[PDB]
Amino acid sequence: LTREAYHRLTPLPHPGGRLFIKPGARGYRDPVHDLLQKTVEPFGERALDLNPGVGWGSLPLEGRMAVERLETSRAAFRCLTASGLQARLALPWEAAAGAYDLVVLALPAGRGTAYVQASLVAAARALRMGGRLYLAGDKNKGFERYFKEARALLGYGVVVRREGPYRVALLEKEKEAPPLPSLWRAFSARILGAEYTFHHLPGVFSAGKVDPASLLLLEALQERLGPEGVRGRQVLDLGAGYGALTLPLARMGAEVVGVEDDLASVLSLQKGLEANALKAQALHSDVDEALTEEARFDIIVTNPPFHVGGAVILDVAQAFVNVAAARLRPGGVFFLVSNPFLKYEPLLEEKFGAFQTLKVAEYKVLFAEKRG
Template sequence: MDSVSLIAQMSYAMALRALPGISTDNRCQVTLYQAKYAEGLAALTEQCDLRLLQSDKSLVNELTAHGYTIQQAQSVEVVNDLVVVLPTKNRLRTCGLIASAMLSLRSGGSMIMVCANTMGAKGYQNLMAELGGDVQVQCKSKCRMFKLHRSADFNTALAMRWQQAAAMQRVDTHGLMSQAGVFSWDRVDIGSQMLVDAVLHAGVRDIHGKGMDLCCGYGFLAVSLLARMHESMQQLHLVDSDGLALDCARRNSEVWQEKVKHHWLDATQEALPGFLDWIICNPPFHREFQQDMALGQAIVQRACAALRKGGVIYLVANRHLPYEKLMREHLSQLDAVDVRQGFKVLRGVR
């Protein structure tokens, strides 16, 4: 079992043990932040009014396939008796989730979070102590299991600062709207800048008609091209599985809204826009906390298939990632147009 599934299973088990001790006149109100399908979820559904929050489309699809309804954000009207937070890779994002979860609790309500020691569990314990006073801690399976009550000691002002710090905001380093937890949210990564430079150098020779920014993130690549080449574009599809990233990309591209379409989908499983003149892509190769080479390969393969005959793809990747053989199986031409600083930019023609 992978570490994220284990953490989810342990979290749901803790929640089930906590339910009998909650005093309420109606069914217990429970919200799962960063919900993931795992053992114990069905039992929770039977014993409380359960809301599941998740912005990753691949995880949403898995939950939906098992009959669950998912929300991307918590309704402000909901007052919870119990909340469960599954940590993310980004500490600022996780602190924002903890803050939102605690603020949604009624007085006396409880928050549960399980975190692996390798994911910074000790640090989260210290942060929770700042936020709410006494933190109950148990250790099991190289994880720390936290329970925090919303008591008179709860620091509302600190929670609101955490929430604000993790919210969508304009970032000075690149001037765009972004959010903690989105890939390279507060800086332009080297690979994306190399990709933009290569595409701008090619110009309208390649970038014209209908295109797609696949795995668009907060929209740096798309906005960089739209700002200089929008007149040659008929339509641009922005695709990402991260709903938070896509919301940022929507904000950043709104000045060109008549040409831009946004798609929240899992590029490895769901249908992509097709018969495209060009594609730009900086594919991920991590799923949750673990490296996943197959993820990037699946996206690259489906990207190549989304091109029309003669269509062009620009892709950036770490130099060690094995995409060339796969791409040559689907393309008539493939060249490395820039290789430096541990990255490579590939240009292919179908």
């Protein structure tokens, strides 16, 4: 994929309408959301979708009742917006208590247990007494555990649809919901001789510790540019997360712009910056979507998303590289770290013309310079 291709929103047909989708946006051709779309039906007047994606799972409700959609992914939010579907940039747990009759929730299993449980409690709290919840999942990805946990929270609940390993359950709130568990976490770490206290919400990458790959990148960057090498320089951190790379670079004096697609991660970065008396731009953005057309940088760094145990570079990761090459000023430098299995070398060679390997250990740190 090219740049325009990655950022393009494409409308796909369905009976009675169209729905916009794009690379990097979850929700389409997803068995769980698909089963939901075949199962959900109206109940009451106010519905809430706590894991919208492109909005296919709860689409049957559109036009038949009021539907609120709390979306955390910017890529997905762009699609919902283009589709004309009511949606808010919001975390699942920001949902108003007891203000809904129906909640639709495709289990966000990929985000981890904490995120899932926060979403389950948010659903229980969002519903009025007697409210209904459609919970969908994969038996191979925790459905049974979470369904049982949802029953414990609400009371009544039974499976109402099955397809292969995919399931949809319907539950009713018969008991008062518990308060929201504390969701903020914080941990201290020493990076390149300095101390930092990172703060993060559920679902962030590498929760509770600085990822070894991120550390490797920073060590390689300092070795190549020096401890003052980024002072006063404009830096773009692709997929900033809670700031493993962002905070140290800001502390080193760089003018950093972090772009992150996940809202929970964006808020984590913002709290971290504040807590460490550091300043940087923490943008909620689908890759470089939030930037001006003219924005350019002196240094770009990234620890791109990846599939555990996979050997294929993800669409978003490829876009990170393409954007890096396009956003760097001539003479500017790009640092990328990844597991040994990913074939980034030919990609960098193609996009930059040449590249270098700065480190080869548990992870490999690749480097490239922008040619004018």
